[PDB]
Amino acid sequence: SPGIWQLDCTHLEGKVILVAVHVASGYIEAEVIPAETGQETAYFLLKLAGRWPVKTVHTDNGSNFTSTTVKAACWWAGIKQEDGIPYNPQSQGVIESMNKELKKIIGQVRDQAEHLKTAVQMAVFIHNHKRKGGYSAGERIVDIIATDIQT
Amino acid sequence: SSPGIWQLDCTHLEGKVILVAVHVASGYIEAEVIPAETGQETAYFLLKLAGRWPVKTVHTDNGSNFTSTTVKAACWWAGIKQEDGIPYNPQSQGVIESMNKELKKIIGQVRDQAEHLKTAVQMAVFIHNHKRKGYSAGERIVDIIATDIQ
Numbered sequence A: 001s002p003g004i005w006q007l008d009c010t011h012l013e014g015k016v017i018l019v020a021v022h023v024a025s026g027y028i029e030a031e032v033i034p035a036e037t038g039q040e041t042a043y044f045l046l047k048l049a050g051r052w053p054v055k056t057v058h059t060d061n062g063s064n065f066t067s068t069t070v071k072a073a074c075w076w077a078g079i080k081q082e083d084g085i086p087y088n089p090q091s092q093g094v095i096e097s098m099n100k101e102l103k104k105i106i107g108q109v110r111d112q113a114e115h116l117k118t119a120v121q122m123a124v125f126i127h128n129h130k131r132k133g134g135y136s137a138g139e140r141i142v143d144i145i146a147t148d149i150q151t
Numbered sequence B: 001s002s003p004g005i006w007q008l009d010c011t012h013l014e015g016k017v018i019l020v021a022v023h024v025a026s027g028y029i030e031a032e033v034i035p036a037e038t039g040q041e042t043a044y045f046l047l048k049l050a051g052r053w054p055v056k057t058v059h060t061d062n063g064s065n066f067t068s069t070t071v072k073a074a075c076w077w078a079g080i081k082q083e084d085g086i087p088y089n090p091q092s093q094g095v096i097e098s099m100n101k102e103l104k105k106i107i108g109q110v111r112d113q114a115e116h117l118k119t120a121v122q123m124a125v126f127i128h129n130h131k132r133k134g135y136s137a138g139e140r141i142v143d144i145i146a147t148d149i150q
Ligand SMILES: O=C1Cc2ccccc2/C1=C\c1ccc2c(c1C(=O)O)OCO2
Pocket: A112, A113, A114, A115, A116, A117, A118, A119, B040, B041, B043, B044, B047, B070, B073, B074, B075, B077, B078
């Protein structure tokens, strides 16, 4: 469970925002891409798994589930690729809520940056630092993974 | 003071620039390929970093990025103390130089498995961070920051 991530893809300004959520903590990484292809998704997972211990990924849709490039990246990085089917239905709502939160932050900083990608990274910054402890998502992920290392 | 300190490091390969941030206390890195090191690239890269780890201090890699107003804007935004990168401890220039070689060596060993340099560079970041030294850099940074919170 310290190793489970969920991929999430949302839209804004006719661009695509790919998001990985660390399910246990709510911590995210996100990027702007021109379209969600297998190649983007695979490259994004390679980045994530080099930066956090990614054991399992719940892919956002069936195309990325099926994608050969995605499977190659998952194999390369040691990731157990899974579907992202909400066998707990509160899953669709939690994600939908995140997407709305993120878009609201992106809107609040909209003005401080010329490009959408800068706004998105500002929104990642704010989401990850936001106090619940009240511990933030960033503190939780570190706490979860550190606990896990000492066992 | 050590859990928040990062060092910027810029190196070259295949006519492109590899921008690296090293968590000084753990050796853990993030890195990107850019067409050229500009203030804007450096500022955007720092914004990314500080959204993903608690970045308190950055030692910039050179005086241009030290001076750059875009880099100062991103440091301000993200709450980062921008410092110089003067190796007051000389054991620094040597540690950074070794890393760059280690990275290029890893990039060379994977270079065949990916069409693009960016992919090879992220493979290298993956290999460096996971390498057992037997704790890894990725293990160390989590333990350093966890200890700090608690
Ligand atoms: O003006 C500000 C304040 C600020 C605070 C934090 C980060 C960036 C910026 C910033 C501009 C900017 C800078 C670099 C970029 C970039 C943009 C942008 O305007 O989108 O796009 C890609 O690299």
